[PDB]
Design a protein around this ligand. Sequence first.
Ligand SMILES: Cc1cn([C@H]2C[C@H](O)[C@@H](COP(=O)(O)O)O2)c(=O)[nH]c1=O
Ligand SMILES: Cc1cn([C@H]2C[C@H](O)[C@@H](COP(=O)(O)O)O2)c(=O)[nH]c1=O
Length: 557
Amino acid sequence: GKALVIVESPAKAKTINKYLGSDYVVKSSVGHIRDLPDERGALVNRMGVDPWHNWEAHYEVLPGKEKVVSELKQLAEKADHIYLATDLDREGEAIAWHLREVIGGDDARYSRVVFNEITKNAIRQAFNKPGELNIDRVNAQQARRFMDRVVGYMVSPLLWKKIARGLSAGRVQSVAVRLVVEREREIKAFVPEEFWEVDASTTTPSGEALALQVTHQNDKPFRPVNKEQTQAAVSLLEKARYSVLEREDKPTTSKPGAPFITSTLQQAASTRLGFGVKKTMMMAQRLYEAGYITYMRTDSTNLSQDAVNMVRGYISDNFGKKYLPESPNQYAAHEAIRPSDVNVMAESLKDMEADAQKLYQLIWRQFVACQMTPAKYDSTTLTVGAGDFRLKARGRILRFDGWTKVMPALRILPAVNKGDALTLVELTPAQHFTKPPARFSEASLVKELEKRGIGRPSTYASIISTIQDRGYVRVENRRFYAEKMGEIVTDRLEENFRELMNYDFTAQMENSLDQVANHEAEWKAVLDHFFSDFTQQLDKAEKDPEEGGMRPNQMVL
Ligand SMILES: Cc1cn([C@H]2C[C@H](O)[C@@H](COP(=O)(O)O)O2)c(=O)[nH]c1=O
Ligand SMILES: Cc1cn([C@H]2C[C@H](O)[C@@H](COP(=O)(O)O)O2)c(=O)[nH]c1=O
């Protein structure tokens, strides 16, 4: 009469099993078990969903999954209750749904356990008050896959006939590419502008060196545009008398960032560790399944009181009172990506390759740092007057490292009083040129997608990978480049699928899927509205170019 517990991977099973008594029998589904394969029976067949028949779906068991199916049913009868312990997100919710449909039986036999980490306490609480499968979330998850399937299978064929065979269309992927093609064109059309800067080396009364940057000439910002203007300014600066007009000494602080969420974890892992989005999410996943960190698909910077209290204890013991804030820091109930146990160091992780330990370390330090006091600096700003010019010297000295103490080990302005005379040693004119917009990176793109409300913790990685192996954009030197085909398709889609390509409408769809997940909308009605708009767009696109249809990629003579 033992209880059955189902998870989606052997790894999770392994870990969760350590915290489940003998009353439980943990089993992995090993994959999704089941999923998908003016109406056209053949189109509907390929899609596995019927837009013209109220979104009737045809879910099939994946290859070689019937064995696992019969393995679960068999274990299901022997169990008095079935616990679907899939991941906490919608996809996890849908997988749980599919397992229940297959294994069949009374709904009362099923509980949906949710937990953001696989630890003794988290599993305890998760299995103490088991919840029910949330059909709204399942519907929100299926609504998403149905529309993605629709766009994919209905827009792609049009692309094959108008542009090229094999091209793919993606509800969100095409919008993502659009961001890259837009950036590509801003860069292409950028005309670098020349501007100059003049730095001045001076000596304080006490003989110390003081590097100054000219900021103003005649109270207006100093922005010479060419060599002649710079020379004229330089010959004036060469004869001027330098003196400190203002000495601004102010205490400043730097606060630690918020604990990681999916998008910032990917950004930081990419910038600091050079890790790609896929690599990061793959390692993050293994760390989560091994019970080392909380769920890695989140956009919440929340930290549980237990997590906060465990880290504050670590900070007090290992860093001291001055690094412990009066009260815990709170940022912006899911959780941030943090270690499951702060006392587990990156070096102590079992069966994790070097890079996964490094990701853990990144996550660990960010988590610890986020609960530490601010770093304190004594900032100094010197405003120097030189005839009609004003020069600036900015300095900074660390007064208290605070949170930076958990980060790896790492300009001193000389002492000058206002009114002091400075001696000019040398003037250095430097030619600069405005730089075109930076190219999207592994990080900055997810960030841009997060910013525009387009992505989603559990889609960022997928979106980034999907737009790459299909000839639209390519990553070179850890940077995105839009391919000719990416621009060609993006122009076609913007012209004939404007609503589908619109950033706001795309962000709004995410809101609409969230409305479904929160019982504020009904999935089929949301799918109907989407399909209505979609088909209207699609019908015009299929027409001849002279009818306002999509332009073929021909270059007629
Ligand atoms: C994995 C996955 C998650 N999700 C999400 C988005 C939501 O932020 C998250 C859980 O949100 P919820 O608590 O509002 O239901 O699940 C999808 O929409 N599709 C997916 O494939
Ligand atoms: C300036 C900037 C850099 N980055 C990144 C991406 C890379 O991780 C890193 C640049 O390093 P890289 O040249 O070695 O690739 O910083 C962003 O993600 N956004 C930005 O706005």
